């Protein structure tokens, strides 16, 4: 190919078109491409239908491409991974009818202010969803209903003030939930259900310690070993167990799991 680098790693045909000041998809890519890197280009707009000739495409990286709009139509039958992180998307595209085999979706660090109803419909194979670093205030009901296989969910560093009571419904395989650095103040009763959740990040929220936090306090007490702090300094990412990181707003860093709840109804 005259523009992009073509490389073969094991069974994968990796095509590298990144960091090339591209404003559009280069034509005549190898038809047996399985991985396409378009990262760090000047695309601003892109259309998934233009990738339909590449019937073996399983991974697509469109990160850091200044995307403001992603046109979605046609079908990429075997795409498993889509990276749309670090763009400027204001609305989440509906990918379900175009990417039925998608298992990983990353739209972190965009400009999402809301998620549409039935946003994830048709994405039955989805296992990882990253929406960290957006501007989400609330989530629609049944958001994760069409994604029962979900294993990782990242909603960290948004502006969430509430979570839907049935957010984690039907998620028997969830192992990582990231909700740190939002504006959450309470957890609805029954939110976590009975499913074991190995990793939960809940620090950096203004938890309101009143009688409404009691369900949360109990869950924290029962799951103290599953509550973690996420911290990135320079390039080093740190993940550390610390249930005391979940703290009451308007206090001397008082941990929610120790909140007495004096005067609350029994």
């Amino acid at each position: 190919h005259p523009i992009c680098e073509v490389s073969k790693v094991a069974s994968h045909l990796e095509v590298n078109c990144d960091k090339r000041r591209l404003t559009a998809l280069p034509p005549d890519l190898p038809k047996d491409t399985t991985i396409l890197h378009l990262s760090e280009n000047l695309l601003y707009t892109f259309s998934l239908a233009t990738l339909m000739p590449y019937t073996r495409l399983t991974q697509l990286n469109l990160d850091r491409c200044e995307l403001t709009k992603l046109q979605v139509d046609g079908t990429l039958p075997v795409l498993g991974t889509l990276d749309l992180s670090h763009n400027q998307l204001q609305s989440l595209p509906l990918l379900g009818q175009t990417l039925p085999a998608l298992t990983v979706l990353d739209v972190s660090f965009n400009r999402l202010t809301s998620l549409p109803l039935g946003a994830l419909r048709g994405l039955g194979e989805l296992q990882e969803l990253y929406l960290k670093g957006n501007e989400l205030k609330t989530l629609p009901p049944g958001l994760l209903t069409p994604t029962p296989k979900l294993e990782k969910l990242s909603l960290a560093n948004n502006r969430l003030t509430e979570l839907p009571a049935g957010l984690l419904n039907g998620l028997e395989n969830l192992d990582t939930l990231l909700l740190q650095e939002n504006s959450l103040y309470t957890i609805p009763k029954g939110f976590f259900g009975s499913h074991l959740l190995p990793f939960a990040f809940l620090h950096g929220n203004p938890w309101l310690c009143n009688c409404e936090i009691l369900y949360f306090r109990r869950w924290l007490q029962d799951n103290a070993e599953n509550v973690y702090v996420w911290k990135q300094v320079v390039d080093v990412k740190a993940v550390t167990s610390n249930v005391a990181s979940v703290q009451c707003d308007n206090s001397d860093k008082f941990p929610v799991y120790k909140y007495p709840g004096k005067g609350c109804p029994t």
């Binding site: 094991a10 298992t103 192992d175 190995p198 990793f199 990412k237 993940v239 550390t240 167990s241």
Partner: protein, 202 residues
């Protein structure tokens, strides 16, 4: 430097560095030099051979991830500059938990050998070891080979033996100090070479 031998393999290799006070700062530098040596011998390039580097004490501190797209010399530099923690506690259970769920959760490259090199010099409080076996079994199901390297007289031998019993491939190495790292490096690297599928020299 010129090592005794080199080999290119289709391999995902995770270095897990004990960050307890059981190792002095100078000894930790020997551990880090050992890691860099292995990266050189294995011709690490984040292409056919990918690496992750985690220092663990109370929690996991990830300096390199398998999908980090950086040039080899930068990877080696990063590993050599891993900060000494010298903490009281280095939890093996937490770092294996982290490895199972956060590093090796998704098998994007099933043809590659997956190895967790667990470099141990300390012994976590038994309070933290309740799910230790579950995590080793978890890695087994994920086709991840766990290679415990015990360093010094304070290495958790009990956990090392437990790792061995979960799967035949989990070969253990027991060293008297960090000075034996370079002495047994060839044997450890050789085991990886004979274990993993071959890769083209870049």
């Amino acid at each position: 430097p010129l090592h005794d031998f080199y080999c290119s393999r289709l391999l995902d290799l995770v270095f897990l560095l004990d960050g307890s006070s059981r190792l002095s700062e100078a000894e930790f530098e020997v551990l880090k030099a050992f890691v860099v040596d292995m990266m050189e011998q294995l011709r690490v390039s984040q292409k056919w051979v990918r690496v992750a580097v985690v220092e663990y004490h109370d929690g996991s501190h990830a300096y390199i991830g398998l999908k980090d797209r950086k040039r080899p010399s930068e990877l080696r530099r990063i590993a050599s500059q891993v900060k000494y923690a010298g903490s009281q506690v280095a939890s093996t259970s937490e770092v294996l938990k982290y490895t199972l769920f956060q590093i090796f959760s998704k098998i994007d490259r099933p043809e590659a050998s997956r190895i967790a090199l667990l470099l141990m010099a300390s012994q976590e409080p038994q309070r933290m070891s309740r799910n230790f076996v579950r995590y080793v079994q978890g890695l087994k199901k994920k086709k991840v080979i766990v290679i415990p390297v015990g360093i010094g007289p304070h290495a958790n031998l009990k956990q090392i033996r437990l790792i061995e019993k979960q799967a035949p491939e989990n070969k253990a190495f027991v060293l008297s100090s960090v000075d034996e790292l370079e002495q047994q490096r060839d044997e450890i690297v050789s085991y990886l070479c004979d274990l993993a599928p071959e890769a083209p020299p870049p």
